[PDB]
Design a protein around this ligand. Structure first.
Ligand code: NAD
Ligand code: NAD
Lengths: 268, 268
């Protein structure tokens, strides 16, 4: 067994043992996968976290906002995974929005320059990463991004929700391109998870009201979710992406998979 | 009669007698409205077109990308419409994407810098215009933007479709803010219309394939539309926005109104 046996998945995200990426990576590895990692800013730190993973995995720098990193991605991955080999999976657990477009700050009040690098890192990054790595994929490969239902306005999230709405719209376009390589591109829309930086926001982080608005949003969930919703266990979201990086969901691409306890489907 | 009798609607867009904005403005005026206009780049030209309108209307410069214009909008509109008066409507007939994110150019191939000012002008502009004018609206006012169903990938449009998906997501957030002023914000999703620059693209404009891909998309429509779809008559789209700027659609905000012959609802 090993759902993901002898597969090469490259994982994005992992910033702390709290990060979802981290949890996919573990579940992934127990499942027989073989990762290669991408780090962003504090590489030495990611490095140290990455060591508690059930298995060693090469880590590589990558600021999704720097061309030369992207220019050189593919080389690097091969160079590591070893030539004559290609990868079967790529996971985009990444996003970011500046103080302003999120939190307490009124909505109309975010600078388009701020709003922008959010879009640049949260949505557009999906395309860059795919155009860059699509050339090294075995057929029947999988590309996956982490989503958060932006289909109805919620409060406090503001422009991060707008950035996700774009994510949803970019994925459809990547599905089109990946199609030619016989590779799939999909989004897993998670329920709220207590990641670190989430934690910080439900604390005083972005504001008081902002915070109390999450708290509540966070509770609507478990209520609504017919099978409930644990905001502290990213394991169910990890096993889904794990289903998607696998060959058991072969006829589905442009798609979004609600890994949310059912919440999105119930009114109250 | 005069659906829009003694109402102050400020219209965005009008670049040629072909432009939709132009058509709303006419229908608007025959309906008893009283406009005030916004021009973008070639003001003298807009000016000359604007004269064939059934009625005189003050025109004002406004590059939705220049802060000081937005900073000074409200003053200008009052200054014109005359102090002690407020407007009941605002129409956002505006958008734009650089060669690259549209047309023949592959999707992965657009620079985020290009992709960006599209987003900046097409989506984000909706928010700026609203934060700026919301202070001068009578209650039960209306804000309307022009939409184009981005809910399924289409070809050739690329990033303009992504920009509209964001538009749809911004509107929901503006509905929230407009709510406090008791003003409404909605999107009219049009079918394809032969505007000038559209014309140019179905000609050789953006590319050959790009062009032949519109042509076809353009025909799927009238087929699909149970009551059909005339790509050369922007009158039905104009009368809808006209319904929406009016008090007959009072309980509906965050919304998108399909002004499309029914196309969006039928598979084949
Ligand atoms: N946590 C939630 O409640 C929730 C729910 C549904 C979806 N998601 C999405 O899941 C994804 C995973 O994020 P998370 O919540 O695990 O949080 P997280 O704080 O662990 O960080 C996600 C990452 O963004 C990275 N980042 C920012 N700029 C970058 C850049 N230039 N290059 C590379 N990485 C960069 C950080 O290094 C970090 O890894 C997020 O994108 C989030 O939108 C999250
Ligand atoms: N034509 C269609 O098939 C179609 C269909 C559905 C929706 N829409 C939308 O309808 C809206 C109306 O556009 P149209 O198709 O009538 O085309 P159009 O070419 O008449 O131009 C729309 C406008 O964008 C303006 N523009 C660009 N940058 C600007 C700036 N910085 N400041 C102010 N104006 C600026 C131009 O001046 C022009 O008026 C568009 O936004 C389009 O997305 C169009």
């Amino acid at each position: 067994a090993g759902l993901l046996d002898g597969k090469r998945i490259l994982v994005s995200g992992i910033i702390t043992d709290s990060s979802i990426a981290f949890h996919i990576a573990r579940v992934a590895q127990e499942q027989g996968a073989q990762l290669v990692l991408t780090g962003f800013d504090r590489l030495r730190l990611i490095q140290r976290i990455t060591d508690r993973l059930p298995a060693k995995a090469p880590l590589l720098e990558l600021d999704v906002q720097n061309e030369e990193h992207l220019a050189s991605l593919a080389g690097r991955v091969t160079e590591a995974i070893g030539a004559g080999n290609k990868l079967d999976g790529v996971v985009h657990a990444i996003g970011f929005m500046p103080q302003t477009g999120m939190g307490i700050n009124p909505f109309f009040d975010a600078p388009y320059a701020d709003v922008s690098k959010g879009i640049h890192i949260s949505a557009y990054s999906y395309a860059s990463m795919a155009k860059a790595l699509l050339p090294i994929m075995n057929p029947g490969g999988s590309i996956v991004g982490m989503d958060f239902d932006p289909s109805r306005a919620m409060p406090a999230y503001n422009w991060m929700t707008v950035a996700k709405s774009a994510l949803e719209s970019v994925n459809r376009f990547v599905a089109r391109e990946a199609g030619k390589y016989g590779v799939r591109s999909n989004l897993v829309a998670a329920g709220p998870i207590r990641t670190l930086a989430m934690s910080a926001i439900v604390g005083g982080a972005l504001g008081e009201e902002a915070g109390a608005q999450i708290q509540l949003l966070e509770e609507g969930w478990d209520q609504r979710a017919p099978i409930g919703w644990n905001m502290k266990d990213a394991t169910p979201v990890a096993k889904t992406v794990c289903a998607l990086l696998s060959d058991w969901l072969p006829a589905t691409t442009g798609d979004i998979i609600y890994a949310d306890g059912g919440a999105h489907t119930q009114l109250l």
